[PDB]
Amino acid sequence: SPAMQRIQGARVLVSGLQGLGAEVAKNLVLMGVGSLTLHDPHPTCWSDLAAQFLLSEQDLERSRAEASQELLAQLNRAVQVVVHTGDITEDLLLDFQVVVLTAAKLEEQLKVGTLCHKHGVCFLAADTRGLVGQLFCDFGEDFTVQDPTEAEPLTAAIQHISQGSPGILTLRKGANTHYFRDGDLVTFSGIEGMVELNDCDPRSIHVREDGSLEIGDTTTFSRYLRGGAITEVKRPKTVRHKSLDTALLQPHVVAQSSQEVHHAHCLHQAFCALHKFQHLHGRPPQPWDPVDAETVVGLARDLEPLKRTEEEPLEEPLDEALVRTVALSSAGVLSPMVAMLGAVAAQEVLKAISRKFMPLDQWLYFDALDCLPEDGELLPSPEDCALRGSRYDGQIAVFGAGFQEKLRRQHYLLVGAGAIGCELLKVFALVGLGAGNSGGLTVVDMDHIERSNLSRQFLFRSQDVGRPKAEVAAAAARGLNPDLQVIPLTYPLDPTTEHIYGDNFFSRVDGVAAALDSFQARRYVAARCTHYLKPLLEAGTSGTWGSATVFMPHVTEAYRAPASAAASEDAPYPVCTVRYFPSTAEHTLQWARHEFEELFRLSAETINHHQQAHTSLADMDEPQTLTLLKPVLGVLRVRPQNWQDCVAWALGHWKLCFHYGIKQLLRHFPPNKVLEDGTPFWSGPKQCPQPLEFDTNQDTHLLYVLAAANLYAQMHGLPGSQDWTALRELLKLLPQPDPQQMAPIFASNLELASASAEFGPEQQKELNKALEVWSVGPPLKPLMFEKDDDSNFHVDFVVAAASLRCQNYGIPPVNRAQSKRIVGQIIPAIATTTAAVAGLLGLELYKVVSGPRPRSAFRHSYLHLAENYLIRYMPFAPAIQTFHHLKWTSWDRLKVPAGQPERTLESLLAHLQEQHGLRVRILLHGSALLYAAGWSPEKQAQHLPLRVTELVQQLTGQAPAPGQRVLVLELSCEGDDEDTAFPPLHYEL
Amino acid sequence: MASMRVVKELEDLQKKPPPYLRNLSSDDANVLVWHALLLPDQPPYHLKAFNLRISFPPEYPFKPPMIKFTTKIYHPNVDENGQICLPIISSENWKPSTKTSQVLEALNVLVNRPNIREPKRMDLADLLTQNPELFRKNAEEFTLRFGVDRPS
Amino acid sequence: DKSDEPLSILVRNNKGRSSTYEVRLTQTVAHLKQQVSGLEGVQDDLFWLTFEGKPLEDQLPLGEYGLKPLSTVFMNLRLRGG
Ligand SMILES: *OP(=O)(O)OC[C@H]1O[C@@H](n2cnc3c(N)ncnc32)[C@H](O)[C@@H]1O
C-alpha cells in the first residue's frame, strides 16, 4: 500500500504518443499513475494505426495526443489525464517526476534527456523501429531503490536466544538458515520477552557453522522468555546512471550472454545509423528499400567502431546483414513489438516512481527479427510493402500485403478472456488476424466480469459487470476492428464438453491461443491441440514474471505440463497431522477453510434433510460435532435473533475456539503426556501448544472478536454497528462479563467422563427436542464462495483466525504475501507482464501464420521484469522415443481403419502385429480395459470375436455418438518399459 | 496416463500376489477402483478377513489413492467411513515414484500391528487408554458381525 | 578428461536469493534439478533452470553447457496466472 501511495500522486510525461507511447500510457493508466500528461503535435496517419489501439479511422489528420486522451481518461477515471498542447519547456519538467520519449528523434531525445538529467527527473527513451525495440533508462546520478529484489521480507521462528556478548541464538528447522546470509540487516519485529529487543533498532547478523546466528551484544537485555519472529530488512542500493549523450558513447546493455551483448551492440549501432540517416536525409528509410538499406549500412560503416565502449577492444566487425535487415523493415511499427516494449517501459516507469525493483541498467535491445521470412524464402518487396491507405500500413511495410492477406484468411481460437486474453484479443484486432470474410476468431470463457477484475482490465468498463466475459471481450474486439468476426462462447474447454468442441469445431480453426489461469486447463487444451494437430500459443504471468511459448506439431516439443502442480491445484488434505499439530500457514488456512465449509456450508443441508431418514449418531461422528457446534453461543432454549455485537456472544467464539478448546486439549494432552507411540519418548515433539487469555492490550484478539461478531451478523442477516468506535471503551471496561458461567461453557453442562450413559435417558430426549427447535430458523443458503467480495468480512476473520492459531501452536505468523496466494484476494496480473506476454504471443503468431517454418525459427520466451530478465530461446526438438522397429514422437498417432465391416479385436491385433511389427499386451479405451494378454484363455477367446465398437458399447454402455469419426484408446506391448508410453491408437470408426 | 500404469501395476501384482491378498479384482468398466481381500497374520485380527476398497484419483501417481474398507471396523487409526490416514498416502509424505505394493505392505504391517498415530475419534483414544479390553471386545464383535470368512 | 574434482556454482532462486552447489561436469542436469528441488522445497517438474539465457535439458550433462566455477544459474518456475 505505501508503495502505490507514491504512484497515486506521481506525475509522468509521455511524448511521441505513437503506438508505443499509447501502450506505455495505457499500462500507466491501468497501474494507477496519478497524473499522465500526453504530448504529441503530429497528426494521425495510416502508418500508425497498425499499432495504436486508441486511434480509429475517424481520428485521421487529428492530433494523436488529443484523440488518445479521450479513451485514456476513460480507462481509469481515477487517473487525471491531460494533454500538453504546446512545446516542451525546461520549467515544465520541474513538475514531472518521470518523462518518456517514445519514438522521438535523436536530437529531441538528447535535449530532453539532458534537461531531465540536470533537474534530476527520470528519463526513458523507448523506441521501436521494425522488429527491434530499443529502450533507454536514466534515473539520475543518485537514485535509491528501497526494494532491490521482488521478494517479501524473510521470516524465521527463533526457538531460543542467548543473553551473551556474542549473542548467538537458535532458530527452528527450515530453509531460512540457508536463506539468511551473513551481513544481512534484520529486525526483531515480534518476540515474547526481550522488551529491549522487541521492535528494536535494525541490527546486523552473522552466521557460522550449524546455523549459529551471531547477532551482537545482548547481555544487558532481559532474560529469554519465549520464541519469536525475526524479519529481514533489505538494504537500499544506490544506482548511478550516465547521461544520455554520455551513455550513447558507452552503451551498458542488459543481456544474458556475451554473444547477446555483441548482438545488442550491433543493434545499437544500427539504431544510431538509422537516426543519423533520418537526420541527414530528413526521412526514415522506405519500406524494404534496397538503396536506403545500403545507405544505412554504409553510414554504419563510416560510423567509427570505438563509439561504443572505448575502453573495450572491438569484439568483431559489425554484421552488415543485421544492420541491413533492421534498416529494411524499420519503416513500420508493429503491434506485438509495441506491446512488449511499452510493457517494459511502463515497468521501468513504475520502478522510477515507486522506487521498487532494480532499475534497468541504462540500455536494453529487444530483438524479434526471426519473424521475417526464412533466409531461403522470398523477401518482401517495396511494391508489396507500398502504402495503400489500409489501417495496417505499417505492418504491411514491415511484411507486405500478401502476408496481411494471409493473416486475414485465418481462423483462430482464443481460450480464456482474461487479462492475457484481453491483451491477446487486442493484439489480434490490431494485427488483423481473421479480419475478413474468409477468416474469423473465436473466444472461449466461462466467468462473468466482477468488480475486482475490471479494475485493471483493458477492455472492460464499469457497466460490464455481470455480463459474460467472452461476449464483452468479443464486443471490445469488434470495436477495435470492425472487420473482425469474433464469435464469443460461454462453454468452457474441459473434458465435460468434448461433444461441443469435437472434430467438427476444431476442423474449422487453424490455431489455438491459450491464456488460462490453471495448469490443468492448459494441459487439457494442449492435449486437444495435439489430438487435432493445431498450433498452440500459450502464455502465463505471475507478479512480474512472464512466459510465452509456441507449440507447433511435428516441429516443437509438446506442452509438458507440471503434473505435480496440476494435482496440487485441487487436492484433498490429510487433516490428521493438521488437526493434531499444524506446522505451516497452509495448515491453519486449510483448517479455517474446512471449518467454515463444514460449520456453515455443509451443515445447512446435512442437519436438515439428510438426518431425517439416513444415518445418525449411532454410526457417525456427530457425538463430537454437536458438542462443537451447539454451545458456541449458549443453550437459550431457542436460537436467538437479537443484535449480535454484545460482549457475551462476541467473546464466546474466541473463548471456545482458542481459549477453552486449547485449555481442554492441554488438560487432555499435556506437553509431558503426548503419547506419540505409547508412553512419552520425547513428549511435545518439536512444539508445545499454549492456551491464550483474551488480553485487551493485544489488538489482534479484539480485532478477531469484532470480526467474528461482524461475520456472524452478516451471515445471520442482522445489522451491526461500528464497534471500533467508543464502544471499544465499553468493551475494555468490562473484560469479565460472567465469571461464574465457567462450567456451562466448557463441555456440555455436567459431563466430565461420559462413562456408560451417565447423562441419563432423558438427556437424549432433551438433545433431540433442542435439535428440532434449532431446525426451525432462517433458511441458511449454501451460497457460493465470494471470491471478490472482500467487504463481507470473511477474509479479515479467516486471516485473523489463521494468524492467531499459528502463533498459538508455536508457528510464526503468516504475512499478507503468503495469504495472497489463496484464491481469496488473489493478486491480479500486472499490466506490464501481461502486455509483454501478449506481445511475445503476437510475435510468435507472426511466424505461425507464416506457414511451414523450421524449429530454429520459433522461440519460446520467459521474462522477469523486476530484475530485467528476458530470454528468447528456440524450443527443444520433439522427444523421439523408440521401441524395436517402432520409432515415434509425442505428435505421432496410430490411425487404424475399422473397415467396411468393423474389424474384430483379434483382427485388430493381427493387423497391428503384421503392419507395425509389435504385439500388444494391454489395450484399454481411456479408463475401461478391452484386451489383456494376461487374461484367462477363455475370457480372451470370448473377447476376440467381438468388434471393437461393440466391445466398447458393451463395456462403457455408450454408443458412439455422432461426430465420433475416430476412437482413441491406449495400448502397450510386450517387452516395453513401465515408464515409456506408446502413441495413442486412433480407431477410425 | 494413470489408467495404464494402474493396470500394469495390478497385472504385475496379480501375477504374484502376497499371501495376505485374495481374490483381488477390479471392474473393467472403471479400472481406477479395486476390490481385495486382506488376510491379517496377527491374532486376534487374523481370525477373519476384510474386503478393502482402494480408489485411484485421475492424477495418479501424482496424488495418493484412497483406501476404504467395505466392512465397518472399530479402530482408532481407521475412519468411520473406512478411510485410513496412512503415513505413506499422506500428502506431506507422498511420492509419485512409489508403488502400490509398498502401500499394501505398509497397510498389512499396520493391521498386523495397530499403532496409535492420530486419534481420529477422541473417544476411541480415551477408551483405548482407559479400558483396552472393551475395545478388543468391540473390535472382535465387529469382525464377527461384518467380516467375511477366511478362504483357502 | 576425467574432471574428478567438483566445482562450485551458484543457482539463483526465483525470490532474489541464491545458494551455492558443488557439482561435477559428468553429473546430469536432472541431478542438479533434484538438488535444487530439495534445497528450495519445490518439485523439479514445476520449474526448469537456465544458464546464459538458454534452458538446460535434463538428459544432457552439465559439461555441454560450458559451466564455469562460480557461474550463475536461474531457476524459472512455470506460471499459472492468466
Ligand atoms: O484468471 P484469468 O483472468 O487469468 O483466467 C483467464 C480466463 O480463463 C477462464 N478459463 C479458465 N479455464 C478455462 C477453460 N478450461 N476454458 C475456457 N476458459 C477458461 C477463466 O474464466 C478466466 O476468465
mmCIF file of N, CA, C and O in Angstrom, chain A residues 563-564 567-568 570-571 573-574 576-577 579-580 620-621 664 668 675-677 921-922 924 926-929 935 939 955 970-972 976-981, chain B residues 1 3-5 7-9 11 15 28-32 59 62-63 80-81 85 89-92 99 113 115-123 125-126 129:
data_model
loop_
_atom_site.group_PDB
_atom_site.id
_atom_site.type_symbol
_atom_site.label_atom_id
_atom_site.label_comp_id
_atom_site.label_asym_id
_atom_site.label_seq_id
_atom_site.Cartn_x
_atom_site.Cartn_y
_atom_site.Cartn_z
ATOM 1 N N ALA A 563 2.674 -31.832 -13.883
ATOM 2 C CA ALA A 563 1.597 -32.659 -13.345
ATOM 3 C C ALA A 563 1.476 -32.539 -11.830
ATOM 4 O O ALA A 563 0.377 -32.659 -11.278
ATOM 5 N N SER A 564 2.595 -32.310 -11.138
ATOM 6 C CA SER A 564 2.542 -32.136 -9.689
ATOM 7 C C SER A 564 1.699 -30.924 -9.314
ATOM 8 O O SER A 564 0.833 -31.001 -8.433
ATOM 9 N N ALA A 567 -2.006 -31.543 -10.056
ATOM 10 C CA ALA A 567 -2.622 -32.321 -8.988
ATOM 11 C C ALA A 567 -2.838 -31.475 -7.738
ATOM 12 O O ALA A 567 -3.887 -31.570 -7.089
ATOM 13 N N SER A 568 -1.858 -30.641 -7.385
ATOM 14 C CA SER A 568 -1.944 -29.868 -6.151
ATOM 15 C C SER A 568 -2.910 -28.694 -6.254
ATOM 16 O O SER A 568 -3.251 -28.102 -5.225
ATOM 17 N N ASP A 570 -6.095 -28.731 -6.919
ATOM 18 C CA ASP A 570 -7.317 -29.097 -6.201
ATOM 19 C C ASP A 570 -7.127 -30.513 -5.664
ATOM 20 O O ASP A 570 -7.339 -31.489 -6.390
ATOM 21 N N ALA A 571 -6.732 -30.615 -4.399
ATOM 22 C CA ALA A 571 -6.399 -31.892 -3.791
ATOM 23 C C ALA A 571 -7.015 -31.997 -2.406
ATOM 24 O O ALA A 571 -7.151 -30.987 -1.704
ATOM 25 N N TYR A 573 -6.909 -33.029 1.611
ATOM 26 C CA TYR A 573 -5.854 -32.853 2.593
ATOM 27 C C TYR A 573 -5.974 -33.891 3.697
ATOM 28 O O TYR A 573 -7.074 -34.097 4.229
ATOM 29 N N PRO A 574 -4.882 -34.572 4.057
ATOM 30 C CA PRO A 574 -4.906 -35.427 5.252
ATOM 31 C C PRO A 574 -4.819 -34.603 6.528
ATOM 32 O O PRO A 574 -3.734 -34.424 7.093
ATOM 33 N N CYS A 576 -5.264 -35.059 9.400
ATOM 34 C CA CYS A 576 -4.882 -35.738 10.636
ATOM 35 C C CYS A 576 -3.713 -35.029 11.314
ATOM 36 O O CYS A 576 -3.799 -34.635 12.484
ATOM 37 N N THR A 577 -2.623 -34.821 10.575
ATOM 38 C CA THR A 577 -1.489 -34.083 11.117
ATOM 39 C C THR A 577 -1.810 -32.605 11.287
ATOM 40 O O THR A 577 -1.307 -31.969 12.219
ATOM 41 N N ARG A 579 -4.808 -31.385 12.057
ATOM 42 C CA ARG A 579 -5.618 -31.289 13.265
ATOM 43 C C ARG A 579 -4.797 -31.565 14.517
ATOM 44 O O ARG A 579 -5.071 -30.982 15.572
ATOM 45 N N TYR A 580 -3.793 -32.438 14.429
ATOM 46 C CA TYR A 580 -3.008 -32.769 15.614
ATOM 47 C C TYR A 580 -1.976 -31.687 15.928
ATOM 48 O O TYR A 580 -1.940 -31.162 17.045
ATOM 49 N N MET A 620 -22.127 -42.377 13.170
ATOM 50 C CA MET A 620 -21.449 -41.206 12.633
ATOM 51 C C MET A 620 -20.716 -40.494 13.763
ATOM 52 O O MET A 620 -20.911 -40.791 14.945
ATOM 53 N N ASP A 621 -19.863 -39.539 13.390
ATOM 54 C CA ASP A 621 -19.063 -38.781 14.343
ATOM 55 C C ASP A 621 -19.786 -37.542 14.866
ATOM 56 O O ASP A 621 -19.132 -36.583 15.293
ATOM 57 N N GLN A 664 -8.811 -27.330 27.118
ATOM 58 C CA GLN A 664 -9.252 -28.717 27.195
ATOM 59 C C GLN A 664 -8.242 -29.650 26.539
ATOM 60 O O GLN A 664 -7.975 -30.743 27.049
ATOM 61 N N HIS A 668 -6.227 -32.540 28.474
ATOM 62 C CA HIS A 668 -6.322 -33.900 27.957
ATOM 63 C C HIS A 668 -4.976 -34.398 27.444
ATOM 64 O O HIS A 668 -4.634 -35.572 27.628
ATOM 65 N N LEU A 675 1.332 -38.946 23.993
ATOM 66 C CA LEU A 675 1.547 -40.364 23.700
ATOM 67 C C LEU A 675 1.822 -40.526 22.207
ATOM 68 O O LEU A 675 0.943 -40.846 21.404
ATOM 69 N N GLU A 676 3.081 -40.289 21.832
ATOM 70 C CA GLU A 676 3.481 -40.425 20.435
ATOM 71 C C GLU A 676 3.394 -41.874 19.965
ATOM 72 O O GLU A 676 2.902 -42.148 18.864
ATOM 73 N N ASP A 677 3.873 -42.817 20.783
ATOM 74 C CA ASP A 677 3.865 -44.226 20.407
ATOM 75 C C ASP A 677 3.485 -45.128 21.579
ATOM 76 O O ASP A 677 3.753 -46.335 21.537
ATOM 77 N N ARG A 921 0.113 -56.252 -25.474
ATOM 78 C CA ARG A 921 -0.210 -56.976 -24.252
ATOM 79 C C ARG A 921 -1.385 -56.385 -23.492
ATOM 80 O O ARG A 921 -2.204 -57.138 -22.966
ATOM 81 N N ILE A 922 -1.487 -55.061 -23.427
ATOM 82 C CA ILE A 922 -2.578 -54.384 -22.738
ATOM 83 C C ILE A 922 -3.133 -53.315 -23.667
ATOM 84 O O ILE A 922 -2.376 -52.565 -24.292
ATOM 85 N N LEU A 924 -6.528 -50.559 -23.640
ATOM 86 C CA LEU A 924 -7.692 -50.033 -22.943
ATOM 87 C C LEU A 924 -8.136 -48.736 -23.603
ATOM 88 O O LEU A 924 -7.347 -48.038 -24.244
ATOM 89 N N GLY A 926 -9.256 -45.435 -22.596
ATOM 90 C CA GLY A 926 -9.389 -44.369 -21.624
ATOM 91 C C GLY A 926 -9.325 -44.854 -20.191
ATOM 92 O O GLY A 926 -8.306 -44.692 -19.514
ATOM 93 N N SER A 927 -10.413 -45.467 -19.726
ATOM 94 C CA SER A 927 -10.491 -46.000 -18.375
ATOM 95 C C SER A 927 -11.038 -47.417 -18.310
ATOM 96 O O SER A 927 -10.943 -48.044 -17.249
ATOM 97 N N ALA A 928 -11.602 -47.940 -19.394
ATOM 98 C CA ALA A 928 -12.132 -49.295 -19.433
ATOM 99 C C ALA A 928 -11.207 -50.179 -20.258
ATOM 100 O O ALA A 928 -10.873 -49.843 -21.399
ATOM 101 N N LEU A 929 -10.796 -51.304 -19.681
ATOM 102 C CA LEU A 929 -9.895 -52.218 -20.364
ATOM 103 C C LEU A 929 -10.661 -53.061 -21.374
ATOM 104 O O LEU A 929 -11.759 -53.549 -21.092
ATOM 105 N N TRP A 935 -4.922 -62.124 -19.579
ATOM 106 C CA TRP A 935 -6.241 -62.626 -19.233
ATOM 107 C C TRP A 935 -6.319 -64.135 -19.437
ATOM 108 O O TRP A 935 -5.507 -64.742 -20.141
ATOM 109 N N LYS A 939 -11.643 -66.111 -21.335
ATOM 110 C CA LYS A 939 -12.101 -64.727 -21.419
ATOM 111 C C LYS A 939 -11.527 -64.034 -22.649
ATOM 112 O O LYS A 939 -12.227 -63.272 -23.329
ATOM 113 N N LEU A 955 -19.070 -52.419 -22.785
ATOM 114 C CA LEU A 955 -18.394 -52.074 -21.538
ATOM 115 C C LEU A 955 -18.842 -50.714 -21.010
ATOM 116 O O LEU A 955 -19.408 -50.616 -19.916
ATOM 117 N N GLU A 970 -5.656 -46.481 -25.575
ATOM 118 C CA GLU A 970 -4.262 -46.667 -25.205
ATOM 119 C C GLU A 970 -3.881 -48.134 -25.322
ATOM 120 O O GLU A 970 -4.693 -49.020 -25.040
ATOM 121 N N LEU A 971 -2.642 -48.388 -25.739
ATOM 122 C CA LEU A 971 -2.148 -49.748 -25.887
ATOM 123 C C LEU A 971 -0.712 -49.833 -25.393
ATOM 124 O O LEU A 971 0.044 -48.860 -25.452
ATOM 125 N N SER A 972 -0.347 -51.017 -24.906
ATOM 126 C CA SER A 972 1.012 -51.345 -24.508
ATOM 127 C C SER A 972 1.408 -52.646 -25.191
ATOM 128 O O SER A 972 0.564 -53.377 -25.712
ATOM 129 N N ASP A 976 8.081 -53.892 -23.368
ATOM 130 C CA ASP A 976 8.205 -52.457 -23.190
ATOM 131 C C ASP A 976 8.610 -52.127 -21.756
ATOM 132 O O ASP A 976 8.591 -52.976 -20.861
ATOM 133 N N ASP A 977 8.975 -50.870 -21.544
ATOM 134 C CA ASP A 977 9.286 -50.375 -20.214
ATOM 135 C C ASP A 977 8.010 -49.923 -19.510
ATOM 136 O O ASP A 977 6.996 -49.616 -20.142
ATOM 137 N N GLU A 978 8.068 -49.897 -18.178
ATOM 138 C CA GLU A 978 6.912 -49.456 -17.405
ATOM 139 C C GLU A 978 6.643 -47.968 -17.595
ATOM 140 O O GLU A 978 5.485 -47.538 -17.547
ATOM 141 N N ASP A 979 7.687 -47.174 -17.827
ATOM 142 C CA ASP A 979 7.536 -45.726 -17.905
ATOM 143 C C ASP A 979 7.274 -45.223 -19.319
ATOM 144 O O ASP A 979 6.660 -44.162 -19.482
ATOM 145 N N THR A 980 7.718 -45.948 -20.343
ATOM 146 C CA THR A 980 7.514 -45.498 -21.712
ATOM 147 C C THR A 980 6.037 -45.564 -22.090
ATOM 148 O O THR A 980 5.272 -46.381 -21.569
ATOM 149 N N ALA A 981 5.636 -44.679 -23.000
ATOM 150 C CA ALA A 981 4.254 -44.589 -23.453
ATOM 151 C C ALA A 981 4.207 -44.700 -24.968
ATOM 152 O O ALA A 981 4.938 -43.995 -25.670
ATOM 153 N N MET B 1 -0.342 -42.021 -18.830
ATOM 154 C CA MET B 1 -1.677 -41.920 -18.253
ATOM 155 C C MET B 1 -1.771 -42.758 -16.980
ATOM 156 O O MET B 1 -1.106 -43.785 -16.853
ATOM 157 N N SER B 3 -4.307 -44.517 -15.894
ATOM 158 C CA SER B 3 -5.019 -45.780 -16.069
ATOM 159 C C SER B 3 -4.085 -46.895 -16.523
ATOM 160 O O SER B 3 -4.161 -48.019 -16.015
ATOM 161 N N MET B 4 -3.199 -46.606 -17.479
ATOM 162 C CA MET B 4 -2.288 -47.634 -17.973
ATOM 163 C C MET B 4 -1.338 -48.108 -16.880
ATOM 164 O O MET B 4 -1.101 -49.313 -16.736
ATOM 165 N N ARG B 5 -0.787 -47.175 -16.099
ATOM 166 C CA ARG B 5 0.122 -47.557 -15.022
ATOM 167 C C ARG B 5 -0.607 -48.339 -13.937
ATOM 168 O O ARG B 5 -0.057 -49.297 -13.380
ATOM 169 N N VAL B 7 -3.224 -50.261 -14.426
ATOM 170 C CA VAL B 7 -3.470 -51.586 -14.990
ATOM 171 C C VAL B 7 -2.203 -52.431 -14.939
ATOM 172 O O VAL B 7 -2.241 -53.618 -14.594
ATOM 173 N N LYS B 8 -1.063 -51.835 -15.296
ATOM 174 C CA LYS B 8 0.191 -52.583 -15.279
ATOM 175 C C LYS B 8 0.563 -53.012 -13.865
ATOM 176 O O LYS B 8 1.010 -54.145 -13.651
ATOM 177 N N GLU B 9 0.387 -52.119 -12.888
ATOM 178 C CA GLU B 9 0.664 -52.484 -11.503
ATOM 179 C C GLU B 9 -0.266 -53.591 -11.030
ATOM 180 O O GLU B 9 0.171 -54.529 -10.354
ATOM 181 N N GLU B 11 -1.730 -55.892 -12.880
ATOM 182 C CA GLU B 11 -1.341 -57.138 -13.534
ATOM 183 C C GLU B 11 -0.085 -57.729 -12.904
ATOM 184 O O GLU B 11 -0.033 -58.931 -12.616
ATOM 185 N N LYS B 15 0.033 -61.298 -10.880
ATOM 186 C CA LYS B 15 0.900 -62.388 -11.317
ATOM 187 C C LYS B 15 1.688 -63.002 -10.166
ATOM 188 O O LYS B 15 2.208 -64.112 -10.314
ATOM 189 N N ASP B 28 -13.888 -53.892 -14.900
ATOM 190 C CA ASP B 28 -13.367 -53.483 -16.199
ATOM 191 C C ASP B 28 -14.013 -52.201 -16.705
ATOM 192 O O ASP B 28 -13.430 -51.527 -17.559
ATOM 193 N N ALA B 29 -15.202 -51.853 -16.206
ATOM 194 C CA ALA B 29 -15.822 -50.590 -16.591
ATOM 195 C C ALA B 29 -15.046 -49.402 -16.036
ATOM 196 O O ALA B 29 -14.878 -48.388 -16.721
ATOM 197 N N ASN B 30 -14.562 -49.510 -14.796
ATOM 198 C CA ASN B 30 -13.798 -48.445 -14.137
ATOM 199 C C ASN B 30 -12.601 -49.107 -13.456
ATOM 200 O O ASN B 30 -12.709 -49.610 -12.335
ATOM 201 N N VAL B 31 -11.454 -49.100 -14.143
ATOM 202 C CA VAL B 31 -10.283 -49.810 -13.644
ATOM 203 C C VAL B 31 -9.577 -49.044 -12.531
ATOM 204 O O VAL B 31 -8.682 -49.594 -11.878
ATOM 205 N N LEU B 32 -9.963 -47.796 -12.280
ATOM 206 C CA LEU B 32 -9.331 -46.990 -11.244
ATOM 207 C C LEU B 32 -9.864 -47.284 -9.846
ATOM 208 O O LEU B 32 -9.577 -46.519 -8.919
ATOM 209 N N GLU B 59 -5.283 -38.173 -11.311
ATOM 210 C CA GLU B 59 -3.916 -37.689 -11.454
ATOM 211 C C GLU B 59 -2.889 -38.616 -10.813
ATOM 212 O O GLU B 59 -1.832 -38.152 -10.365
ATOM 213 N N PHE B 62 0.576 -38.830 -9.139
ATOM 214 C CA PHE B 62 0.844 -37.542 -8.512
ATOM 215 C C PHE B 62 -0.140 -37.209 -7.398
ATOM 216 O O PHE B 62 -0.108 -36.086 -6.884
ATOM 217 N N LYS B 63 -1.009 -38.149 -7.020
ATOM 218 C CA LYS B 63 -1.943 -37.970 -5.931
ATOM 219 C C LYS B 63 -2.177 -39.341 -5.310
ATOM 220 O O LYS B 63 -2.534 -40.281 -6.038
ATOM 221 N N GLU B 80 -14.394 -43.575 10.334
ATOM 222 C CA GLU B 80 -15.702 -44.211 10.455
ATOM 223 C C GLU B 80 -16.197 -44.732 9.114
ATOM 224 O O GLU B 80 -16.809 -45.806 9.052
ATOM 225 N N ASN B 81 -15.944 -43.996 8.034
ATOM 226 C CA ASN B 81 -16.374 -44.413 6.707
ATOM 227 C C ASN B 81 -15.457 -45.464 6.095
ATOM 228 O O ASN B 81 -15.779 -46.000 5.029
ATOM 229 N N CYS B 85 -5.765 -42.970 7.436
ATOM 230 C CA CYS B 85 -4.767 -41.904 7.364
ATOM 231 C C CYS B 85 -3.361 -42.504 7.407
ATOM 232 O O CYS B 85 -2.577 -42.288 8.330
ATOM 233 N N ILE B 89 0.348 -42.613 2.289
ATOM 234 C CA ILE B 89 -0.588 -41.882 1.443
ATOM 235 C C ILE B 89 -0.818 -40.455 1.912
ATOM 236 O O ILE B 89 -1.609 -39.732 1.295
ATOM 237 N N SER B 90 -0.160 -40.030 2.988
ATOM 238 C CA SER B 90 -0.256 -38.641 3.419
ATOM 239 C C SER B 90 0.378 -37.725 2.380
ATOM 240 O O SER B 90 1.414 -38.054 1.795
ATOM 241 N N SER B 91 -0.254 -36.571 2.148
ATOM 242 C CA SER B 91 0.240 -35.646 1.133
ATOM 243 C C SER B 91 1.628 -35.121 1.474
ATOM 244 O O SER B 91 2.440 -34.882 0.573
ATOM 245 N N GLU B 92 1.920 -34.936 2.763
ATOM 246 C CA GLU B 92 3.229 -34.440 3.167
ATOM 247 C C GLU B 92 4.331 -35.474 2.972
ATOM 248 O O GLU B 92 5.512 -35.109 2.974
ATOM 249 N N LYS B 99 5.231 -47.440 -5.353
ATOM 250 C CA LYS B 99 4.360 -48.433 -5.959
ATOM 251 C C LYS B 99 3.291 -48.874 -4.967
ATOM 252 O O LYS B 99 3.491 -48.830 -3.750
ATOM 253 N N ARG B 113 -0.105 -54.913 13.258
ATOM 254 C CA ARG B 113 0.426 -54.284 14.466
ATOM 255 C C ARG B 113 -0.191 -52.902 14.574
ATOM 256 O O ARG B 113 0.363 -51.912 14.075
ATOM 257 N N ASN B 115 -1.202 -49.243 15.620
ATOM 258 C CA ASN B 115 -0.403 -48.179 16.205
ATOM 259 C C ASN B 115 -1.263 -46.936 16.362
ATOM 260 O O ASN B 115 -2.083 -46.626 15.492
ATOM 261 N N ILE B 116 -1.069 -46.227 17.472
ATOM 262 C CA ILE B 116 -1.835 -45.016 17.771
ATOM 263 C C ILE B 116 -1.047 -43.850 17.180
ATOM 264 O O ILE B 116 -0.128 -43.304 17.793
ATOM 265 N N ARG B 117 -1.399 -43.479 15.949
ATOM 266 C CA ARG B 117 -0.732 -42.367 15.280
ATOM 267 C C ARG B 117 -1.480 -41.059 15.510
ATOM 268 O O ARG B 117 -0.917 -40.087 16.024
ATOM 269 N N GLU B 118 -2.760 -41.020 15.132
ATOM 270 C CA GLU B 118 -3.581 -39.838 15.313
ATOM 271 C C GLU B 118 -4.962 -40.288 15.779
ATOM 272 O O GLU B 118 -5.581 -41.152 15.131
ATOM 273 N N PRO B 119 -5.465 -39.741 16.885
ATOM 274 C CA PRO B 119 -6.802 -40.123 17.360
ATOM 275 C C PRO B 119 -7.905 -39.505 16.516
ATOM 276 O O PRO B 119 -8.414 -38.430 16.851
ATOM 277 N N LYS B 120 -8.259 -40.164 15.408
ATOM 278 C CA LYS B 120 -9.315 -39.651 14.537
ATOM 279 C C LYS B 120 -10.594 -39.384 15.319
ATOM 280 O O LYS B 120 -11.298 -38.400 15.062
ATOM 281 N N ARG B 121 -10.908 -40.247 16.281
ATOM 282 C CA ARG B 121 -12.002 -40.032 17.220
ATOM 283 C C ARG B 121 -11.425 -40.034 18.627
ATOM 284 O O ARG B 121 -10.790 -41.012 19.038
ATOM 285 N N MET B 122 -11.643 -38.940 19.362
ATOM 286 C CA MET B 122 -11.018 -38.795 20.674
ATOM 287 C C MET B 122 -11.588 -39.790 21.677
ATOM 288 O O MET B 122 -10.871 -40.264 22.568
ATOM 289 N N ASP B 123 -12.877 -40.118 21.553
ATOM 290 C CA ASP B 123 -13.468 -41.108 22.446
ATOM 291 C C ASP B 123 -12.816 -42.472 22.268
ATOM 292 O O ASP B 123 -12.647 -43.210 23.246
ATOM 293 N N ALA B 125 -9.644 -43.030 21.470
ATOM 294 C CA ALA B 125 -8.372 -42.973 22.182
ATOM 295 C C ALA B 125 -8.580 -43.036 23.689
ATOM 296 O O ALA B 125 -7.841 -43.729 24.398
ATOM 297 N N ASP B 126 -9.585 -42.317 24.197
ATOM 298 C CA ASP B 126 -9.852 -42.325 25.633
ATOM 299 C C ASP B 126 -10.219 -43.722 26.119
ATOM 300 O O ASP B 126 -9.715 -44.188 27.149
ATOM 301 N N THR B 129 -7.178 -46.054 26.026
ATOM 302 C CA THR B 129 -6.250 -45.806 27.123
ATOM 303 C C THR B 129 -6.822 -46.235 28.468
ATOM 304 O O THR B 129 -6.066 -46.668 29.345
#
